[PDB]
Amino acid sequence: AGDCLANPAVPWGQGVEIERALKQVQVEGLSGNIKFDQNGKRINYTINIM
Amino acid sequence: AFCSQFSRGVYAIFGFYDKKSVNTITSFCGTLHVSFITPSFPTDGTHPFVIQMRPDLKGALLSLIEYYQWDKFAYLYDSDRGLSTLQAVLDSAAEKKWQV
Amino acid sequence: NSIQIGGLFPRGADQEYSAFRVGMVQFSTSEFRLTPHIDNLEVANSFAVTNAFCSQFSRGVYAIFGFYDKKSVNTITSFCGTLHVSFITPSFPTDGTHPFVIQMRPDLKGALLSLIEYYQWDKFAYLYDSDRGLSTLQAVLDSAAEKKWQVTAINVGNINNDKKDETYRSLFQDLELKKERRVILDCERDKVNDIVDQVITIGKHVKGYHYIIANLGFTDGDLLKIQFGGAEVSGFQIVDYDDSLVSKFIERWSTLEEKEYPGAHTATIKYTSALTYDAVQVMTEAFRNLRKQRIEISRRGNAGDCLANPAVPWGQGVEIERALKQVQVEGLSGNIKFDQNGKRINYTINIMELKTNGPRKIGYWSEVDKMVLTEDDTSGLEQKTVVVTTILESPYVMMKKN
Ligand SMILES: *[C@@H]1O[C@H](CO)[C@@H](O)[C@H](O)[C@H]1NC(C)=O
Numbered sequence: 065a066g067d068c069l070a071n072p073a074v075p076w077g078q079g080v081e082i083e084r085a086l087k088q089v090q091v092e093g094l095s096g097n098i099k100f101d102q103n104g105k106r107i108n109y110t111i112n113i114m
Numbered sequence: 115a116f117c118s119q120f121s122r123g124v125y126a127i128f129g130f131y132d133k134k135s136v137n138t139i140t141s142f143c144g145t146l147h148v149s150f151i152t153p154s155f156p157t158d159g160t161h162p163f164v165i166q167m168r169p170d171l172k173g174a175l176l177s178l179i180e181y182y183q184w185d186k187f188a189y190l191y192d193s194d195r196g197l198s199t200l201q202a203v204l205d206s207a208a209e210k211k212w213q214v
Numbered sequence: 215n216s217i218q219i220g221g222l223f224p225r226g227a228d229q230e231y232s233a234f235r236v237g238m239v240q241f242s243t244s245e246f247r248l249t250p251h252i253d254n255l256e257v258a259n260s261f262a263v264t265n266a267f268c269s270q271f272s273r274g275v276y277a278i279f280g281f282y283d284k285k286s287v288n289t290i291t292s293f294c295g296t297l298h299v300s301f302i303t304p305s306f307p308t309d310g311t312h313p314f315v316i317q318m319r320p321d322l323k324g325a326l327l328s329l330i331e332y333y334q335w336d337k338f339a340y341l342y343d344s345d346r347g348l349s350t351l352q353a354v355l356d357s358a359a360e361k362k363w364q365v366t367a368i369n370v371g372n373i374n375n376d377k378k379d380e381t382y383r384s385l386f387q388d389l390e391l392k393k394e395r396r397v398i399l400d401c402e403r404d405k406v407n408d409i410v411d412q413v414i415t416i417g418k419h420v421k422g423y424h425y426i427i428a429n430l431g432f433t434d435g436d437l438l439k440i441q442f443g444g445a446e447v448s449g450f451q452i453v454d455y456d457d458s459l460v461s462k463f464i465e466r467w468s469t470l471e472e473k474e475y476p477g478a479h480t481a482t483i484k485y486t487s488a489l490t491y492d493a494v495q496v497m498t499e500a501f502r503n504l505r506k507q508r509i510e511i512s513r514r515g516n517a518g519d520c521l522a523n524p525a526v527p528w529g530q531g532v533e534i535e536r537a538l539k540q541v542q543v544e545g546l547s548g549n550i551k552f553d554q555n556g557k558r559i560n561y562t563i564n565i566m567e568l569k570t571n572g573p574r575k576i577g578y579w580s581e582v583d584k585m586v587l588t589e590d591d592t593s594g595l596e597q598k599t600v601v602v603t604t605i606l607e608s609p610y611v612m613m614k615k616n
């Protein structure tokens with residue numbers, strides 16, 4: 065991968081496929097339901113009021 | 115440290131960030147397309163290639179203040195943790211008649 | 215004779231760079247000369263700022279003159295805190311004591327808090343923009359509980375420019391619920407001109423309203439559009455065009471060709487660019503004091519990769535910090551001086567009320583003395599039509615038969 069200050073900024077292709085995979089994950093966990101929008105913020109989630 | 119992992123060639127980075135350091139990661143991962151997965155407080159705005167585990171608490175706080183039917187209250191905040199949520203209750207203080 | 219320095223300029227800051235080139239010529243002596251390296255980049259993208267700062271560090275400069283955004287200020291302040299490189303800037307000062315930062319912009323927080331106390335305000339609006347740090351918002355909020363003010367803070371920044379007509383018409387609908395007549399605008403000189411035009415559309419600029427533009431360029435933005443409505447408009451000006459020093463600078467400024475120097479063929483200069491011109495005089499006099507003090511600063515060799523672990527800081531940066539932080543010269547921004555933290559000290563901010571005849575110097579404050587100017591016996595308007603209201607009810611007020 066080399067240096068991070070690579071000029072010009074060479075963005076590797078498979079990074080955009082990793083971004084799509086993460087946000088498409090929909091499972092269950094200690095926080096309730098977990099699914100993401102195209103930005104990465106929680107949706108269909110549950111906050112208990114105690 | 116973000117570069118110490120890029121050279122090692124990681125495929126995604128789990129981490130955290132502070133109020134001062136959040137923008138460093140958000141724009142770094144935005145150009146180099148590295149995926150950042152973190153629980154730290156959600157990005158103020160839409161920053162791509164970031165996965166925030168902690169849900170958006172601010173939307174829940176506004177709803178709770180309504181059910182209790184408050185009008186004047188004190189709001190304590192620390193500038194270190196941030197104030198993205200105090201911002202949200204100050205903006206909505208005019209529409210909903212609050213003397214914070 | 216060649217001193218290398220790095221320049222970080224926003225791509226849309228042509229006048230702010232035009233003033234920089236003018237400063238290079240005005241302070242160029244035969245003893246030496248400064249050699250700039252100019253990188254025009256996106257100021258908000260901190261990755262570009264990191265890539266830019268490390269470009270100058272590998273080339274081995276001695277100081278860096280640049281800007282920063284909220285999204286990027288920490289990137290500059292932390293690299294300069296470790297590598298001990300000195301950073302001179304006209305942007306907003308850092309929220310805190312950070313070494314190796316030469317803040318050319320004065321702290322406005324002390325000004326706004328007392329301008330409020332002069333008009334005897336106890337309930338007002340505060341439309342802020344986080345693009346220049348939430349430093350001032352924490353100031354008005356902290357002093358709101360001490361003096362028991364009733365303030366409304368509205369993050370007007372994050373608004374889209376396509377739904378701007380419906381949202382701006384919506385903001386003033388909320389402020390009407392308390393009939394707010396005292397508003398502070400804390401945007402940059404750009405978004406202020408957006409709010410100004412939307413204030414004229416809905417007509418909230420007649421007798422009754424009182425605005426306070428909260429930036430160091432009251433005359434920089436356009437005021438002639440809310441001048442005659444009848445609303446009192448206060449402000450702040452740091453480039454005193456009355457001083458013969460600036461008038462000397464303005465005369466040569468008004469004549470330069472606009473093709474070689476964009477946005478410079480006018481009679482005024484923005485407080486950003488004016489601070490840029492006054493930054494060159496700080497750096498030139500900084501190194502000249504290193505010469506006279508018999509101090510040797512040239513790098514021993516390659517500074518290396520800024521990401522060098524462990525980070526070894528070149529020692530002579532401390533002398534450059536102590537050199538820049540001990541400069542004391544006079545420029546467009548009046549008096550210039552720095553503390554051990556680089557913050558502006560011993561300075562002077564001018565207060566401006568907008569009247570029928572244009573901007574008028576009314577007041578000024580200082581970090582020791584607040585609101586002193588008394589008064590403006592000169593200028594003056596001597597024109598005041600008093601508005602008297604009454605009700606149509608006989609026989610107190612009756613319309614004549616004709
Ligand atoms: C939304 O969350 C609930 C609660 O876990 C879950 O049962 C449901 O399947 C989720 N919706 C979708 C479309 O997955």
Ligand SMILES: *[C@@H]1O[C@H](CO)[C@@H](O)[C@H](O)[C@H]1NC(C)=O
Nearest residue numbers: 542549550551552559560561
């Ligand atoms: C403070 O400012 C005054 C007014 O310009 C100046 O004469 C004086 O030398 C300054 N003092 C210090 C200690 O910088």
